[PDB]
Each structure stands twice: as structure tokens, then as C-alpha cells.
Copies of this chain bind each other. A is one copy, B any other.
Amino acid sequence: GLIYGNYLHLEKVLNAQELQSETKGNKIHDEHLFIITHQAYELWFKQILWELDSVREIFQNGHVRDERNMLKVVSRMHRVSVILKLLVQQFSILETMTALDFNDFREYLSPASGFQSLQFRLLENKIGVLQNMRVPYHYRDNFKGEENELLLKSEQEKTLLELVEAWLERTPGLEPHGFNFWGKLEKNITRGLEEEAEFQKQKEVLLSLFDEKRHEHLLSKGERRLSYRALQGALMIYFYREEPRFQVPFQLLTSLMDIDSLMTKWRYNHVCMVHRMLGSKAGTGGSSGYHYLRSTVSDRYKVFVDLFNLSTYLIPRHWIPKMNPTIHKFLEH
């Protein structure tokens, strides 16, 4: 007969708490909280990696092409968002520890830090954080052996951003000899602008959308991440989100943005707590601490920044290329 404790391998989970304070003969009560909090964070990182890798594989094995798999994809990405939302709230627990009580066992941690969280790095990589865009103080130095391996894989293997890019490139309606969404959009913006103080600034920005080369330049830097075609596909799904075939894809784009918002919210709630815990003192990891973590709360680490930025290029309803009754029929189930 299967038993709860055996099923859950609690013989491992609940025998994994060793206070260094106690091991060096000066047991500090709050060190137990510090350990349990990190462990719970790490269990949830594992669940997020389990969800994220199953979704990467659904794109990578071509299953995403079968639209009956979209409910699964959006449920699993929504589940990632719900977990991250709990991980943002979970800082509330560690904030019941005073800086003063933390200061009593802090010495016994050196030089260990969150910089040595394999799962946190795997998570960043698998979503599509680029190493060349990371702020310094580098990242992978902390790791060695069978772990530095897994990290290299996570960097080399296809990211969620790349798989979503590939899928967005294949979006119905972009075909120049098909619905020709882009051609019609350039025309409608160009006309609508002419049919008009302020108009000169928005004229500039809107028509910038149609500059492949500029996009390629901003891309070459890393101020954009998606191919120019992927961006068209995304904008197609935004404007035609009510068309049956675009409903759940739109939900997916929304959830990809949610995961960026919640990852940055996690970075900021971490920062707000570390300020109270250390002030201006440096982290046991070696970094300036507070000031480095503040730098990670930027669009540098927003993988799906393109999806946020498309809100720049929103236009009146009237201008969106009307859906030809035959194209309507292609976008029905």
C-alpha cells in the first residue's frame, strides 16, 4: 500500500534542513526560516521548469501546429504565472525576519548566494534571457561540472522566445499573395494619417513600424528580440484576436507578457527586501548587492519586450484592414 510520506519522499524533503549556525555551535532560530523559504522557492522553480520544458517540447516537436493543443499550452503558461504570483507573495514570509536577527547567522552563509541557484539561471535561459544582455557583477563562473553543462545546454537549446518566434512567423494572414495584412496596414495607416500640433510625432512613430532595416538594427543591438515577420504575426493576433483561431493564441501572448511582468516583480520584491536586510553593505556572493539587483529590474531582462512595445503602434478601429468574408472563414474552427 502506497503511503503519503513515501509517495512524497518526505524522508528526503523533511531531512534537508541543516542550520550552519547550529553546525558551527551557535544555533540561530531564524536560520530555519531562511532555509525553508529558499527550499520552497526551489521546489516551485522545479515545477516552473517542468511546465516550461513541456511547452518548449510541444512547439519543438511540431504538436503546436495542431491547434487542439493550444488549450494545454495556454493552461500550462497560465499555471507558470499563478506559481510566480505565489513566489512574489512568498517574500512576505521572509520579511517577518528582522535585519537584526538575519545579522546573527549571516556570517555562517559566506560566500554562498542566490547567484549559485542553477534553477533560477536555467529558468532565465529557457525563457530566453540573452547572456550578452546580462548586466555584469560573469554569471556562469559560479557553476562547474554536470551543472555548468546543463547551463550551456539551456543557453544553446531553443528558448521559449525562439520557439514562439518560429510559430509567430507562420501566423495565417501575413502572406503577400494571401490576405496581405502588412501591405493593407501600411496603406490604411498612410491614408488615415493624410486624412488628418500632435499628428507629426505619431506620424513618425507609426511609419517606423514599416522600416525592416531599422528593426534589424534595433534587433542587432537587443532593443528588439523578435524577427520582423514574428512582430507582424503578433500584431495580426492582437488586431484580429476575436477571430476564433486567434482567441487562445491572443491569451498565450497575454500570458507571455504576464510571465515577464511577474519575473520583474519577483526581481523588485527581492530588491525591496534586500534593501531592509543589508542596506548599502555588499552581498556574501561578492556583488555591491542592493545596486546590482536594482539593475536587473530593467527591460534588459524582459524577453517579450516586443509584445509590450506593440502598444506604441495601436490605431483607430476604422484603420485595421477589414476581414474579407473568405479570410474570416479561414480563421473559423
Contacts and interface: CB of A to CB of B under 8 A. Distances in A.
Interface of A: 1-10, 12-18, 20, 29, 32-33, 35-36, 38-40, 42-44, 46-47, 50, 54, 67-72, 75, 78-79, 82-83, 85-86, 89-90, 92-93, 96, 98-100, 103-104, 108-119, 142, 147, 198, 201, 205, 238-239, 241-245, 247-248, 250-251, 254, 257, 261, 264-265, 268-269, 272, 275-282, 297, 299, 308-314, 317, 331-333
Given A43-B13, A67-B244, A112 B1 contact: yes
A261 B265 contact: no
B311 A4 contact: no
A134 to B, nearest CB: 18
B38 A100 contact: no
B242 A69 contact: yes
A309 to B, nearest CB: 5
Q: Secondary structure of the A side of the interface?
A: helix
A333 B331 contact: yes
A71 B242 contact: yes
A265 B271 CA distance: 11
5 contacts: A2-B109, A10-B42, A14-B46, A67-B244, A67-B332
Most chain B CB atoms below 10 A, which of A14, A198, A242, A310 = A14
